[PDB]
Amino acid sequence: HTRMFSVWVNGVDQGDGQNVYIRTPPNTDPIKDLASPALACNVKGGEPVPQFVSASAGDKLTFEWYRVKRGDDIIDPSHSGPITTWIAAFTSPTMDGTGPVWSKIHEEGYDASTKSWAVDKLIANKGMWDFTLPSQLKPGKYMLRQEIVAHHESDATFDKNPKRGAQFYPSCVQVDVKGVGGDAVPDQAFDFNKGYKYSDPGIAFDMYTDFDSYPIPGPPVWDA
Ligand SMILES: OC[C@H]1O[C@@H](O[C@H]2[C@H](O)[C@@H](O)[C@H](O[C@H]3[C@H](O)[C@@H](O)[C@H](O[C@H]4[C@H](O)[C@@H](O)[C@H](O[C@H]5[C@H](O)[C@@H](O)[C@H](O[C@H]6[C@H](O)[C@@H](O)[C@H](O)O[C@@H]6CO)O[C@@H]5CO)O[C@@H]4CO)O[C@@H]3CO)O[C@@H]2CO)[C@H](O)[C@@H](O)[C@@H]1O
Ligand SMILES: [Cu+2]
């Protein structure tokens, strides 16, 4: 259990984002049903918030996460798994992030050298998660989506044991991308309800064995 507090732009906190520029769900509960409309932007994903983060293409962004209170333990260390970041054009305000619209822009999963997960790193860096807005990206509004997947109970699938299964923690942020950017339009058009399946070995994943690597679900990072 976890959710986002604010976004930082080149190391500058834009201030509490919850129901401002983040589509903040009412609590920290996980999505587990891969058929749920909420898989994409969580439980209030379809409700506009009034603001957009201001950034230029190429800018470094930091997503800041918390569990109960800002600056706390962030998420339970049991909750090992990867952290992926996505982009989609802002089609209309009542978009909810369903359909074939997403391109993946960053991922960290399992680092075998350190035996460290993305989540272990999120914790040790106090809920701060960094990535870059592609410098080639075309100026305009987009939704960013960033997702912690936790695998403490991914050793079964939800469809077989509803009391278990992988847990998805998606956060969608509204961003007005300015500066020069380039001509890149995100064009992987990945659909989460279609594209995440119980058969994916990055979902049906047993973290309680001697494993050497973790296959992160979805396409590779957008070639930009
Ligand atoms: O399978 C074989 C292997 O098993 C391993 O053991 C595993 C085991 O399999 C697995 O089932 C187990 O799972 C437990 C997790 O480890 C543990 O983290 C999890 O704790 C949850 C807890 O269930 C939940 O209630 C709690 O909810 C909080 C939430 O954190 C918090 O954000 C929210 O806060 C709200 C405030 O209260 C409110 O004031 C404010 O306004 O809103 C906030 C939210 O917006 O409150 C809720 C409820 O109070 O979250 C915690 C986690 O943070 O429990 C799981 C059990 O169901 O893990 C085991 C390992 O750890 C063996 O280890 C291995 O040997 C075997 O091979
Ligand atoms: Cu949890």
Side-chain angles (χ1 to χ4, degrees):
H1 299 51
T2 190
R3 58 190 204 184
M4 273 190 44
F5 179 82
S6 67
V7 174
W8 303 57
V9 183
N10 304 326
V12 186
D13 190 352
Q14 308 293 103
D16 185 9
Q18 295 176 94
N19 295 303
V20 181
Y21 56 72
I22 313 174
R23 298 204 180 191
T24 303
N27 64 36
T28 50
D29 285 355
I31 314 298
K32 302 208 291 171
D33 185 345
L34 292 178
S36 152
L39 180 62
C41 284
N42 223 311
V43 143
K44 297 177 77 200
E47 304 206 324
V49 298
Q51 305 307 347
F52 299 76
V53 174
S54 206
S56 317
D59 273 356
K60 210 256 279 300
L61 294 186
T62 305
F63 281 18
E64 190 187 326
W65 293 77
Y66 81 107
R67 188 156 73 64
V68 180
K69 268 192 97 163
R70 199 186 199 188
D72 69 348
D73 54 358
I74 315 307
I75 183 172
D76 191 315
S78 69
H79 282 36
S80 311
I83 299 183
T84 48
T85 308
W86 310 72
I87 192 157
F90 201 75
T91 52
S92 80
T94 54
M95 78 180 283
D96 67 1
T98 65
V101 294
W102 294 103
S103 299
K104 184 184 288 169
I105 67 163
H106 186 266
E107 75 189 351
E108 307 200 14
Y110 182 80
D111 178 339
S113 57
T114 57
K115 311 173 80 175
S116 166
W117 287 96
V119 156
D120 290 304
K121 175 189 180 176
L122 175 67
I123 291 159
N125 288 325
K126 302 194 118 287
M128 306 289 173
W129 198 253
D130 282 352
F131 69 89
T132 313
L133 265 198
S135 75
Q136 281 310 114
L137 174 61
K138 188 180 179 176
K141 294 159 166 197
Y142 301 84
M143 192 93 81
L144 287 158
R145 174 185 178 278
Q146 191 176 87
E147 184 194 54
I148 298 137
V149 188
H151 296 297
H152 52 294
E153 305 184 328
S154 298
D155 55 353
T157 57
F158 172 82
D159 60 339
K160 306 266 141 208
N161 190 345
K163 302 225 182 127
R164 300 195 65 89
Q167 300 184 2
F168 305 80
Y169 298 90
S171 185
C172 295
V173 176
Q174 301 179 167
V175 60
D176 188 7
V177 167
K178 68 219 66 219
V180 72
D183 306 334
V185 181
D187 66 359
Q188 305 191 143
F190 188 75
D191 174 330
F192 294 104
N193 293 293
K194 248 201 62 165
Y196 283 8
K197 331 231 230 267
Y198 296 118
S199 66
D200 189 312
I203 285 167
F205 178 78
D206 186 355
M207 76 175 262
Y208 301 110
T209 61
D210 187 340
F211 67 87
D212 227 327
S213 67
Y214 170 75
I216 304 161
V221 172
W222 185 36
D223 59 6

